[PDB]
Amino acid sequence: MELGELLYNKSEYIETASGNKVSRQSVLCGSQNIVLNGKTIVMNDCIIRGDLANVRVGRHCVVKSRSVIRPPFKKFSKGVAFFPLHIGDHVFIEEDCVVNAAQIGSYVHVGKNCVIGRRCVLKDCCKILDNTVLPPETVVPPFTVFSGCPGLFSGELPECTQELMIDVTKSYYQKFLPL
Amino acid sequence: SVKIAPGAVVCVESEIRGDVTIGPRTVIHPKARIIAEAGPIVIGEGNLIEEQALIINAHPDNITPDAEDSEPKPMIIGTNNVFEVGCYSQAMKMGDNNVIESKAYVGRNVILTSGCIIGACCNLNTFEVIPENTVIYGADCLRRVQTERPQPQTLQLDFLMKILPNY
Amino acid sequence: EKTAVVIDLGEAFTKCGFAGETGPRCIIPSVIKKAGMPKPIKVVQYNINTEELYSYLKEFIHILYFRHLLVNPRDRRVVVIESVLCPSHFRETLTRVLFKYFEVPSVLLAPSHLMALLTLGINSAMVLDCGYRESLVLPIYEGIPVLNCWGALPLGGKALHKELETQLLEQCTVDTGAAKEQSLPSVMGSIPEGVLEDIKVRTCFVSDLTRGLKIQAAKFNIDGNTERPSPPPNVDYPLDGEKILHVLGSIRDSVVEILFEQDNEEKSVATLILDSLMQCPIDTRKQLAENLVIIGGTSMLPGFLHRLLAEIRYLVEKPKYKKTLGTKTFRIHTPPAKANCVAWLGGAIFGALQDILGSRSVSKEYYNQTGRIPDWCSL
Amino acid sequence: ASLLQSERVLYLVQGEKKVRAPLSQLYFCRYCSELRSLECVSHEVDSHYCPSCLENMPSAEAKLKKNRCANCFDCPGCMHTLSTRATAYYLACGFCRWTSRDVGMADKSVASGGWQEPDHPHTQRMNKLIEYYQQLAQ
Numbered sequence: 001m002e003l004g005e006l007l008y009n010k011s012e013y014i015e016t017a018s019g020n021k022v023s024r025q026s027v028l029c030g031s032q033n034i035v036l037n038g039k040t041i042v043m044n045d046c047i048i049r050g051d052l053a054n055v056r057v058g059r060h061c062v063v064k065s066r067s068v069i070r071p072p073f074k075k076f077s078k079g080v081a082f083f084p085l086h087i088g089d090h091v092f093i094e095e096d097c098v099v100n101a102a103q104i105g106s107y108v109h110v111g112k113n114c115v116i117g118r119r120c121v122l123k124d125c126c127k128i129l130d131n132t133v134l135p136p137e138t139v140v141p142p143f144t145v146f147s148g149c150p151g152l153f154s155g156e157l158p159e160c161t162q163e164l165m166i167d168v169t170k171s172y173y174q175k176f177l178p179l
Numbered sequence: 180s181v182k183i184a185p186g187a188v189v190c191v192e193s194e195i196r197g198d199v200t201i202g203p204r205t206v207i208h209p210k211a212r213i214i215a216e217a218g219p220i221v222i223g224e225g226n227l228i229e230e231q232a233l234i235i236n237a238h239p240d241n242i243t244p245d246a247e248d249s250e251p252k253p254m255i256i257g258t259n260n261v262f263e264v265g266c267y268s269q270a271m272k273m274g275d276n277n278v279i280e281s282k283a284y285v286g287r288n289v290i291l292t293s294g295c296i297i298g299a300c301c302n303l304n305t306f307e308v309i310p311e312n313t314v315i316y317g318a319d320c321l322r323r324v325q326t327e328r329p330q331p332q333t334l335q336l337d338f339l340m341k342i343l344p345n346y
Numbered sequence: 347e348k349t350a351v352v353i354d355l356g357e358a359f360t361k362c363g364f365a366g367e368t369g370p371r372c373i374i375p376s377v378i379k380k381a382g383m384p385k386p387i388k389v390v391q392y393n394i395n396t397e398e399l400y401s402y403l404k405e406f407i408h409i410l411y412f413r414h415l416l417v418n419p420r421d422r423r424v425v426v427i428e429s430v431l432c433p434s435h436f437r438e439t440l441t442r443v444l445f446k447y448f449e450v451p452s453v454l455l456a457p458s459h460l461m462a463l464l465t466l467g468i469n470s471a472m473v474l475d476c477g478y479r480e481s482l483v484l485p486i487y488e489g490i491p492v493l494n495c496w497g498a499l500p501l502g503g504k505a506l507h508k509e510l511e512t513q514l515l516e517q518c519t520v521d522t523g524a525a526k527e528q529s530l531p532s533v534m535g536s537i538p539e540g541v542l543e544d545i546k547v548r549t550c551f552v553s554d555l556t557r558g559l560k561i562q563a564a565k566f567n568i569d570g571n572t573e574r575p576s577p578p579p580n581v582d583y584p585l586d587g588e589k590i591l592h593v594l595g596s597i598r599d600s601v602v603e604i605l606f607e608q609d610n611e612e613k614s615v616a617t618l619i620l621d622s623l624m625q626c627p628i629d630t631r632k633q634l635a636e637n638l639v640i641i642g643g644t645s646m647l648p649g650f651l652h653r654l655l656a657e658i659r660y661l662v663e664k665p666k667y668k669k670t671l672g673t674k675t676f677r678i679h680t681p682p683a684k685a686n687c688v689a690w691l692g693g694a695i696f697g698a699l700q701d702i703l704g705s706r707s708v709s710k711e712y713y714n715q716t717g718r719i720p721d722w723c724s725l
Numbered sequence: 726a727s728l729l730q731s732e733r734v735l736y737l738v739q740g741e742k743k744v745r746a747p748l749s750q751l752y753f754c755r756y757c758s759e760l761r762s763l764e765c766v767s768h769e770v771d772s773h774y775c776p777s778c779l780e781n782m783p784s785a786e787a788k789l790k791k792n793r794c795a796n797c798f799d800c801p802g803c804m805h806t807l808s809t810r811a812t813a814y815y816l817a818c819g820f821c822r823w824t825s826r827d828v829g830m831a832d833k834s835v836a837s838g839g840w841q842e843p844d845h846p847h848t849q850r851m852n853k854l855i856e857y858y859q860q861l862a863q
């Protein structure tokens with residue numbers, strides 16, 4: 001709201017360990033294969049399944065409520081297996097959002113309730129708008145905005161994304177405290 | 180009131196309610212919401228369910244007319260059927276060889292045939308039988324297109340047999 | 347020298363590409379998606395303030411020169427195709443945008459009718475331009491446009507889109523998907539122009555003269571009991587997903603008739619050729635009649651060229667045109683590119699001529715000095 | 726940029742044309758002392774690239790190829806980047822289930838090399854007209 005990030009008070013129940021905060025409400029079925037190296041946030045009722053995964057997330061990663069990050073299955077003639085996805089640094093997944101994406105780049109703002117397709121690659125410094133469908137096996141270049149049910153180039157982003165996005169994710173993390 | 184079948188890798192951690200009737204080779208993913216409110220949920224072999232998938236038989240909650248005498252409305256589902264991420268479903272009769280896409284709201288009385296796909300993030304409340312081997316794409320408009328051949332998804336289901344153990 | 351770019355700014359669609367090519371590289375709706383506005387504003391709009399028009403054209407030309415075409419604007423020349431009697435302030439603005447902001451080397455303001463003639467190769471021909479706003483005709487005799495014998499009527503895309511909307515609202519039968527299986531009239535107060543255009547193209551067609559003449563008298567109902575031909579089957583068209591509009595068979599073949607209707611004045615798209623040709627010089631009559639050219643996207647409509655050429659030969663026998671244009675052989679030219687992209691193709695053929703282009707075209711150095719674009723009005 | 730409403734508080738530019746824009750969008754000019762907008766500044770062309778198969782193409786190759794990638798294709802029905810599927814290759818879309826088999830294009834033995842667009846029907850008549858007008862312009 002007018003550049004400034006607003007207050008969000010968390011409850012007592014949340015798994016805070018080595019900077020990484022993960023809501024107890026949010027199930028993450030397969031805790032072994034999933035890894036959170038940095039000071040990540042995972043909001044309540046969110047899913048990070050371990051269906052033969054290697055879900056590596058960023059330094060300041062944010063996943064809002066009711067949102068799912070599942071790896072896609074690669075339809076290979078040699079052997080059909082689930083491809084391990086790698087969420088980049090400073091990644092912001094918005095609320096109620098579906099992600100079946102392989103290799104999500106750093107410094108990205110994925111919009112609200114937007115379905116990303118199977119085996120979908122996202123390069124760094126991009127932005128997917130809300131109520132948008134990226135089809136299976138699609139690529140989005142840097143400094144781009146993809147939107148619509150087709151999921152196609154809408155326009156370009158501001159030049160200063162790399163520097164700006166840092167402030168957003170770090171401010172949200174700092175502003176997001178217990179009550 | 181549960182009719183669990185061997186071979187089917189239904190995960191215990193997924194939520195189930197009512198007079199369920201489980202299929203031979205079905206594979207239910209965790210946090211898959213199946214309810215048998217009025218009539219039973221009949222499941223065909225190879226009918227895998229992925230992530231959030233609201234399958235209810237609550238026509239008594241939807242309308243509540245107090246008509247059709249008993250009105251069981253038993254939820255029949257076919258074989259080799261992929262339920263994707265966040266797709267709402269409520270179909271009394273549903274055919275074999277059909278794949279609803281992610282966040283697809285299927286209607287209160289919509290009958291699915293073979294080789295037929297619902298569009299991702301597309302909602303269809305209107306009651307209308309789907310033609311043989313035709314796909315719907317987009318939310319803004321339906322834009323129906325007839326497919327050349329039906330698409331099978333057997334290999335995917337078969338591999339989950341190996342994964343689900345110790346999860 | 348570099349291959350000069352060709353742009354053709356229209357109300358409905360803009361043609362864009364490079365000179366010495368078989369057709370245009372990009373053809374897109376002439377609109378811009380501004381932040382806040384739900385429906386995108388139209389870039390060409392006549393009779394508005396210059397500053398507001400300048401901003402829209404600046405926004406549009408930017409999209410053409412970077413997103414659609416990939417080339418530096420300052421490097422290579424421009425060939426701006428625009429119809430004769432295009433509003434003064436609009437053409438003045440369009441040039442001022444290209445010369446000031448983009449800093450183009452030189453613009454050439456070619457008339458669309460003379461460019462359409464080059465594509466065929468014939469030196470003299472009559473040219474009808476059935477566009478979006480107005481269906482204009484202009485006789486071109488051996489390189490010289492005859493402004494004296496001009497002709498225009500508002501029987502284009504806009505007039506046809508409006509006529510379709512009116513007819514659909516009368517016989518309105520939509521299946522919303524909310525106990526609307528029964529015929530539901532005018533659930534939506536207005537239909538968006540994007541939908542109406544798609545219905546027109548796919549559903550509606552141009553009828554034969556014999557069947558059309560019956561349709562005219564049928565809807566009139568001039569002391570006759572159900573004297574209409576059997577219509578085509580009713581086509582169901584989806585509106586915004588769930589809502590299914592059942593288009594009546596009568597609407598498909600009646601909507602077009604407003605173009606070819608006489609309406610007492612004796613002013614149709616057909617009559618406009620013969621009205622112009624009768625006003626032409628006596629020596630030029632037989633050459634122009636033999637060489638007819640039908641450009642514009644409105645004439646793409648299926649079975650338009652047959653109805654027009656037939657309606658011509660019927661209106662010839664009418665006593666007004668029977669004296670002058672009685673024993674004349676009307677033959678249509680088939681241009682190499684499609685009816686929509688005839689105008690553009692001429693500018694590309696002209697753009698390929700680097701030697702003549704530089705001389706005829708107005709240089710930026712001249713515009714910066716003078717600030718006076720040459721027009722067919724007095725200097 | 727979008728999450729926080731950068732499109733609220735705006736900075737003004739000095740010159741002929743005054744514009745109200747967010748600081749995120751604006752650029753500072755160091756040669757002189759005056760910040761200028763994306764509108765005010767002149768735009769150039771550096772490099773061309775495909776959004777699917779990210780391959781930096783030179784300016785000369787683009788003019789020959791009409792600003793297009795040879796390997797990648799976009800579907801005609803819906804506007805999305807197509808994918809090569811085998812059985813011996815057919816082109817298919819992910820969003821809509823439109824195939825290359827539907828329109829009746831034959832499957833190619835080689836993956837990328839086989840696929841092509843038909844020649845323009847009025848390409849021979851075109852060159853003859855140019856050469857006529859070229860001689861006449863001369």
Ligand SMILES: Nc1ncnc2c1ncn2[C@@H]1O[C@H](COP(=O)(O)OP(=O)(O)O)[C@@H](O)[C@H]1O
Pocket residue numbers: 355356357358359360476477478479503543547642643644645646647686
């Ligand atoms: N291929 C086509 N088939 C049928 N109708 C068309 C086609 N292309 C355009 N049209 C219709 O005819 C009109 C042609 O207008 P156009 O000549 O492109 O614009 P302008 O007259 O402003 O240059 C469009 O508005 C559209 O309604």
Ligand SMILES: [Zn+2]
Pocket residue numbers: 775776777778779780794795796797
């Ligand atoms: Zn490519």
Ligand SMILES: [Zn+2]
Pocket residue numbers: 800801802803804805818820821822823
């Ligand atoms: Zn497609």
